[PDB]
Write a protein that binds this ligand. Structure first.
Ligand SMILES: [Ca+2]
Ligand SMILES: [Ca+2]
Ligand SMILES: [Ca+2]
Lengths: 233, 234
């Protein structure tokens, strides 16, 4: 009857861009460096005995999640509600390309979680479609926060936009303050705690931010190696 | 647009932490593990080449800051504005003692940054006394976020209550939402970035939460020695 720990892990680096090319729901793959980052995060998070792992179906997230599944003996459940924000006309574009089409729009966008100037989803939309998964897991996982092993976390493996929107919504931050959360890094993780409440009211659970954007330390020699494995230059 | 990086490091573990005994402004000592974890965090944070270090005068924070000063070669400035929340009549009491004397009070306090049923400070009081240190540093450290090495952080070494209150205030979250920022762990750290356009005043800096409550990974071999050293020093 304790607090429910909820961990959210962002995928590692993809083989696509290493910069500002927005991905959205494009189904890009991890680079060798991103796979190494996923191992490093799984080494830390595995020690905490997750209760279950749920991943976005996008390969960059799923393959990250499998590294944690291998280290915990858990199967990776896949839920399309954990997909990254659909970025509409902006998927596959760099900041430079967006800024040339509409100067000022990208920066107004970061500060208005209700806006989707691209034909895709706003951050509010993303929270609205992912929050029901957390409510379902509260209803369906009686061991989560239970008396036997109350600190075993549910782990969600997903994407930076999803994690920021879902965390801000669970925390009940006013939408004006959603930009307070800086972007999640490569294979970084976040932890929220949902504190006990009478009855079965999900809305009565009060969430608090325990960890935002923590990461595993990885040696420079390993980072150099994994980056090099991907290229012949 | 430039950015100033601000790192806040919590003190290492004390015996009161292990015992779930509220500390507040009591001047408790680092345990053997607290010293060890402070070294490990200094190893991580030292690589960032901090610009300067300011620490609370409470020894658990100061002794943590000294490990970072030794690793970096920097002096540790001391500022009482970085002291932990004064917890009033709760200082020295365990969670169970508080819950027996005032059931629901600890929970109310966790959910309300204006609440101080213990007679000490609220988190609003703690932010109000500590935020001026950050404005003073902005006004008096032209190198911070400056030309040569813009990413070198200012490091404040303090306490979990202070760090949550000061961070929420810098982010300008409404007070109602300050309880969204929870605890900080044993020598864990938080990082905010202050973004500003050249010419702006302190209030025009927009702060963002880059990292909340990150930690250094420590090997099971070094946890087992600090446990043996804490045990053998009964
Ligand atoms: Ca490793
Ligand atoms: Ca245009
Ligand atoms: Ca390749």
């Amino acid at each position: 009857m304790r607090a429910r720990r909820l961990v959210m892990l962002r995928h590692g680096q993809t083989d696509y861009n290493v910069g500002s090319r927005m991905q959205g729901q494009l189904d890009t793959e991890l680079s060798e460096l991103g796979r190494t980052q996923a191992v490093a995060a799984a080494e830390v998070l595995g020690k905490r005995q997750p209760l279950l792992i749920v991943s976005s179906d996008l390969r960059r997230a799923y393959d990250t999640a499998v590294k944690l599944g291998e280290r915990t003996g858990l199967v990776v459940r896949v839920d399309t509600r954990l997909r990254e924000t659909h970025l509409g006309d902006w998927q596959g574009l760099t900041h430079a390309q967006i800024d040339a089409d509409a100067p000022g729009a990208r920066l107004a966008w970061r500060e208005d979680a209700t806006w989707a100037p691209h034909g895709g989803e706003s951050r509010v939309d993303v929270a609205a479609r992912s929050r029901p998964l957390v409510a379902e897991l509260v209803a369906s996982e009686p061991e989560w926060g239970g008396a036997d092993e109350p600190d075993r976390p549910v782990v969600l493996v997903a994407h930076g936009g999803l994690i920021a929107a879902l965390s801000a919504a669970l925390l009940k931050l006013p939408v004006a303050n959603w930009p307070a959360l800086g972007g999640m890094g490569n294979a970084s993780w976040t932890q929220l705690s949902g504190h006990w409440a009478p009855g079965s009211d999900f809305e009565s659970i009060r969430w608090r931010l325990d960890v935002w954007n923590a990461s595993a330390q990885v040696s420079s020699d390993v980072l150099k190696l994994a980056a090099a494995l991907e290229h012949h230059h």
